[PDB]
């Protein structure tokens, strides 16, 4: 009736100071009494903001133009916009990430009935948006005249727009002050979807579109804030002129910012956390790269709402070998997540993650989320271009410190296809390995971590040469993706 | 000697060395003596060990071009002091005081964690040190 | 108000005789309250001689003819022939 | 173009050409524009083709350092 | 390609012909007595979803109405005459 406990507990590993990383250990299997896809993944990003899935795209220029932010926020995660570009560009990026799906659209493009129809085609090319309401003065402060539609422009141009729009007598509409559950039903039951909202004075105040009900059906896991639009993040630097960049990003409606730094503990960074949290009380803020609890204290005292952790460990990085300063990633994530947990702040494990097993390890060590670089580079919506080189469809991967001194390299990665199929493979690999561990949710997994129920063993170098070994002539993987 | 990146210079200084001394890292700079030969498509310059021609206790090899030492030494200086900033020391004298006072703290980097930065996780790459 | 000390001190590394080299260890980061180019580098070479920078060229025949001694002494260091 | 050695220059002059125009043989000299990067232990400098970014009719590559055009 | 059973190759060439059309001459059609879960079945089986309704559920019958993907945003169970648009 007694079975000996086997394997080192969580704390017994990182007592002997050998500086372990994700390769150096395993997690012993448990007991299974649930289906592989039953388990929950809800995870905090910062004190007030929570995600339906623990995946984040890294704010590198070679990873996160707006198209990845969209395609990752649509599947639980969150996307941080790279900062090494002019503030006006970064504000535009975060603006068109916010506007991909909407609740009450509160600032539509609208037109006066006197326009030429070639100006509708101009607006459609300039905005992508194409089902436009018409008002007498061509602004929100006017009576509703009609709607014009992509379905109205199958016809050279030249016509005055009142000839081709559909008029206010014939379209359906709802009264203002309606909540976004009755207006939704009224659009569903008036089965022709572009329903405008007007006050009792019959003037335009907002509109709703069926396409976003279609997006809600299609992407049930997407992370949307109170106004029912995608959550968006920006990196910003710590410099005196990023104080201007902040205002444009906030006027564009960013929800979270990460104070991007190689070494988070600086007096410049701690002063900037105060400036952000005094001027803009709503914004959640994430602290710059820390590796030891002795430097997490300054960030949490400043008022930061989460931390990102790890330095010099990374694929593209060379900071350990230029600065001499760093810490092995597996030790760092645990030894700071145990401390930061006392104050209730989340931790996000920053980079050095190159297979699904490294994500399950990072989460079973106290990280509230992981953050991805190379594993999302060369997906379809990672920005730029592909070039065939020595017969491989590879796409660039630039480190920010890679062009006073250079502390990253610049390189390239083979194609991985659309992030829309890749993220579900990470989710179905994490939750399927969380089954073998024996945890019904990630909150239960970190409870097992801190209770001693999980048990690890050190994988000596001779045992790292296991799986896909020096015991095949040649081989092919095929992750179903 | 045994110093082959700016991180090894900061480690040697934060361990009690008053100075470092360079070999291979200054070989194939412009004012290192002799001549360049293109070999297998590389503008490399000779590197001879003094024990490499009674027994031989050094090899004779070659190193790729690093340009003028007049730009290379400021890159070493601006890499040392920029890493001494991350350590938290305002001078090398303060750094060795931290060494001998216990304020500096190290960790052992197990072999698996030496495979970090510029890793087995890229197809191919180019560094571009400012040099 | 208390934060646990993390990491081996200087002496605790080289007590266990595993013969570490520069690759085998890291230096944990501290607190930053100065600009990266503020730091001083003045370093002794020998009891009576001090240099504005801690770099020396090795006295190998393949490294130090006079032209390197000049170009390195001109930038803080020193050159051995 | 297609000149990649001194012998090809002499052949091109002894065939009628009044002068010879050099591409690759002057790339990666010191005053060719841009930057040098270590790829695989080589101090090489970029060599972009104009038809290498509608279709692409050139490649983009790199060449090992040749020192000053003055020598 | 021909190295597969004739029935498969006939299906392939059939669904290559039917990707765009002039007068669709043999559409999928339904009787107004069907359950709406059979419209979802037909949409999954054919990809085509804007389906006309006729009294005997075949081309040899009077029109009754049309059903479209815009009519299936709602468990199933309903008789199809409740949710069509009528003739
Ligand atoms: N872990 C990493 O190493 C890592 C990760 C992601 C990005 N990066 C990138 O690498 C660069 C590394 O430098 P950094 O992280 O110190 O940020 P940085 O680029 O803003 O700082 C550059 C230099 O100026 C100093 N500095 C920073 N803010 C300052 C201020 N307000 N006033 C005065 N001096 C200031 C820093 O000490 C540093 O020496 C960053 O630009 C960052 O985008 C590094
Ligand atoms: N016009 C519009 N309506 C939405 C959108 N998203 C959700 N709705 C619906 O509006 C309602 C939102 O109110 P809530 O009750 O807080 O949201 P919910 O019930 O949790 O539904 P989900 O957030 O989609 O999981 C739900 O019925 C949603 O299905 C959207 O993006 N646009
Ligand atoms: N109404 C409106 N939607 C906008 C605007 N900017 C972005 N959008 C988003 O764009 C989505 C799709 O636009 P639709 O006009 O519905 O697209 P569509 O013309 O019907 O054609 P499809 O794209 O084929 O559905 C909307 O549901 C909004 O989420 C804007 O100014 N007005
Ligand atoms: N319902 C339907 N109508 C079409 C289709 N293709 C073309 N039409 C239109 O029906 C007419 C076909 O008659 P034709 O005069 O012989 O074709 P066309 O003028 O050469 O036009 P294209 O073949 O499209 O270049 C044209 O107006 C076409 O634009 C189709 O695929 N479906
Ligand atoms: N009408 C009809 N079209 C068919 C059939 N089989 C294939 N198709 C083709 O499928 C095309 C698109 O089908 P639609 O019914 O228009 O697609 P939809 O369901 O309205 O939805 P969208 O694809 O979003 O426009 C048609 O235009 C035909 O070319 C069939 O049995 N009937
Ligand atoms: N509120 C409304 N009430 C009724 N009809 C409307 C309303 N708004 C637009 N319409 C009209 O109904 C028709 C269908 O509009 P809808 O918005 O569904 O077209 P659409 O989605 O742009 O078409 P498509 O997908 O083919 O591009 C058009 O003639 C349009 O002008
Ligand atoms: O140039 C650089 N120098 C140092 N660290 C960088 C640089 N660029 C990116 N990083 C780090 O690399 C991570 C990307 O994840 P990775 O691909 O696993 O290495 C980022 O999130 C940063 O932490
Ligand atoms: O022939 C040799 N045998 C052994 N050591 C040598 C020889 N020549 C030079 N050295 C050492 O190599 C150092 C040069 O630095 P290195 O390039 O890092 O090896 C010199 O300063 C000497 O300590
Ligand atoms: O992108 C390109 N496509 C085609 N020809 C080019 C391109 N760029 C330059 N050229 C030509 O190619 C020659 C290259 O010279 P070479 O490198 O010495 O062979 C140039 O002198 C031009 O005549």
UniProtKB/Swiss-Prot annotation, chain B:
IMP binds at residues 1-2, 23-24, 47-51, 57. Induction: Constitutively expressed. K(+) binds at residues 116-118. It comes from the Eukaryota. Coiled coil: none annotated. It is found in: Cytoplasm; Nucleus. IMP type I is the main species in normal leukocytes and type II predominates over type I in the tumor. Homotetramer. Catalyzes the conversion of inosine 5'-phosphate (IMP) to xanthosine 5'-phosphate (XMP), the first committed and rate-limiting step in the de novo synthesis of guanine nucleotides, and therefore plays an important role in the regulation of cell growth. Could also have a single-stranded nucleic acid-binding activity and could play a role in RNA and/or DNA metabolism. It may also have a role in the development of malignancy and the growth progression of some tumors. It is linked to Retinitis pigmentosa 10: A retinal dystrophy belonging to the group of pigmentary retinopathies. Retinitis pigmentosa is characterized by retinal pigment deposits visible on fundus examination and primary loss of rod photoreceptor cells followed by secondary loss of cone photoreceptors. Patients typically have night vision blindness and loss of midperipheral visual field. As their condition progresses, they lose their far peripheral visual field and eventually central vision as well. Leber congenital amaurosis 11: A severe dystrophy of the retina, typically becoming evident in the first years of life. Visual function is usually poor and often accompanied by nystagmus, sluggish or near-absent pupillary responses, photophobia, high hyperopia and keratoconus. Because IMPDH activity is tightly linked with cell proliferation, it has been recognized as a target for cancer and viral chemotherapy and as a target for immunosuppressive drugs. The activities of the antitumor drug tiazofurin, the antiviral drug ribavirin, and the immunosuppressive drugs mizoribine and mycophenolic acid (MPA) are attributed to the inhibition of IMPDH. In addition, bacterial and parasitic IMPDH's differ significantly from mammalian enzymes, which makes it a suitable target for anti-infective drugs. Belongs to the IMPDH/GMPR family. This is Inosine-5'-monophosphate dehydrogenase 1. It comes from Homo sapiens (Human). The gene is IMPDH1. The chain holds residues 365 to 509 of 514 of the full protein.
UniProtKB/Swiss-Prot annotation, chain C:
IMP type I is the main species in normal leukocytes and type II predominates over type I in the tumor. Transmembrane segments: none annotated. Induction: Constitutively expressed. It comes from the Eukaryota. Coiled coil: none annotated. It is found in: Cytoplasm; Nucleus. Belongs to the IMPDH/GMPR family. Homotetramer. Catalyzes the conversion of inosine 5'-phosphate (IMP) to xanthosine 5'-phosphate (XMP), the first committed and rate-limiting step in the de novo synthesis of guanine nucleotides, and therefore plays an important role in the regulation of cell growth. Could also have a single-stranded nucleic acid-binding activity and could play a role in RNA and/or DNA metabolism. It may also have a role in the development of malignancy and the growth progression of some tumors. It is linked to Retinitis pigmentosa 10: A retinal dystrophy belonging to the group of pigmentary retinopathies. Retinitis pigmentosa is characterized by retinal pigment deposits visible on fundus examination and primary loss of rod photoreceptor cells followed by secondary loss of cone photoreceptors. Patients typically have night vision blindness and loss of midperipheral visual field. As their condition progresses, they lose their far peripheral visual field and eventually central vision as well. Because IMPDH activity is tightly linked with cell proliferation, it has been recognized as a target for cancer and viral chemotherapy and as a target for immunosuppressive drugs. The activities of the antitumor drug tiazofurin, the antiviral drug ribavirin, and the immunosuppressive drugs mizoribine and mycophenolic acid (MPA) are attributed to the inhibition of IMPDH. In addition, bacterial and parasitic IMPDH's differ significantly from mammalian enzymes, which makes it a suitable target for anti-infective drugs. This is Inosine-5'-monophosphate dehydrogenase 1. The gene is IMPDH1. The chain holds residues 11 to 91 of 514 of the full protein.
């Amino acid at each position: 009736g007694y079975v000996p406990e086997d394997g080192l507990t969580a704390q017994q590993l990182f007592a002997s100071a050998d500086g372990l990383t994700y390769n150096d250990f395993l997690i012993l299997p448990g007991f299974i009494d649930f289906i592989a896809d039953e388990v929950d993944l809800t995870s905090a990003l910062t004190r007030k903001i929570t995600l339906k899935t623990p995946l984040i795209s890294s704010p590198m220029d070679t990873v996160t133009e707006a198209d990845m932010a969209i395609a990752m926020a649509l599947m639980g995660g969150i996307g941080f916009i790279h900062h090494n570009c002019t503030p006006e560009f970064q504000a535009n990026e975060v603006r068109k990430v916010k506007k991909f799906e909407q609740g009450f659209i509160t600032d539509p493009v609208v037109l006066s009935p006197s326009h030429t129809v070639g100006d509708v085609l101009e607006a459609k090319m300039r905005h992508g948006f194409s089902g436009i309401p018409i008002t007498e003065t061509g602004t929100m402060g006017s009576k509703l005249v009609g709607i014009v539609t992509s379905r109205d422009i199958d016809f050279d141009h030249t016509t005055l727009l009142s000839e081709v729009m559909t008029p206010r007598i014939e379209l359906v509409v709802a009264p203002a002050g309606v909540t976004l559950k009755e207006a939704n039903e009224i659009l569903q039951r008036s089965k022709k979807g572009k329903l405008p909202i007007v006050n009792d004075c019959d003037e335009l105040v907002a509109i709703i579109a069926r396409t976003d009900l279609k997006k809600n059906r299609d992407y049930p896991l997407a992370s949307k804030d109170s106004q029912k639009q995608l959550l968006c993040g920006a990196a910003v630097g710590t410099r005196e002129d990023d104080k201007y960049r902040l205002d444009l990003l906030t006027q564009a409606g960013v929800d979270v910012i990460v104070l991007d730094s190689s070494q988070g503990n600086s007096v410049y960074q701690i002063a900037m956390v105060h400036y952000i949290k005094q001027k803009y009380p709503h914004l959640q803020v994430i602290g710059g790269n820390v590796v030891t609890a002795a430097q997490a204290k300054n960030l949490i005292d400043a008022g930061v709402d989460g931390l990102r952790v790890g330095m010099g460990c990374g694929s593209i990085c060379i900071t350990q070998e230029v600065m001499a300063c760093g810490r092995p990633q597996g030790t760092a994530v645990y030894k700071v997540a145990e401390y930061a947990r006392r104050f209730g702040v989340p931790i996000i494990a920053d980079g050095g993650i190159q297979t699904v097993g490294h994500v399950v390890k990072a989460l079973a060590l106290g990280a509230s989320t992981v953050m991805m670089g190379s594993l999302l580079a060369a997906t379809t919506e990672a920005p730029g271009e592909y070039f065939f080189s020595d017969g491989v469809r590879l796409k660039k991967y630039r480190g920010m410190g890679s062009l006073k001194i250079a502390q990253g390299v610049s390189g390239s990665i083979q194609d991985k296809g659309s992030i829309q199929k890749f993220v579900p493979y990470l989710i179905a690999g994490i939750q399927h390995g969380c089954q073998d561990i024996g945890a019904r949710s990630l909150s239960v997994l970190r409870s097992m971590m801190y209770s001693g129920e999980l048990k690890f063993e050190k994988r000596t170098m001779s045992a790292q040469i296991e799986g896909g070994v020096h015991g095949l002539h040649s081989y092919t993987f095929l992750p179903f993706t």
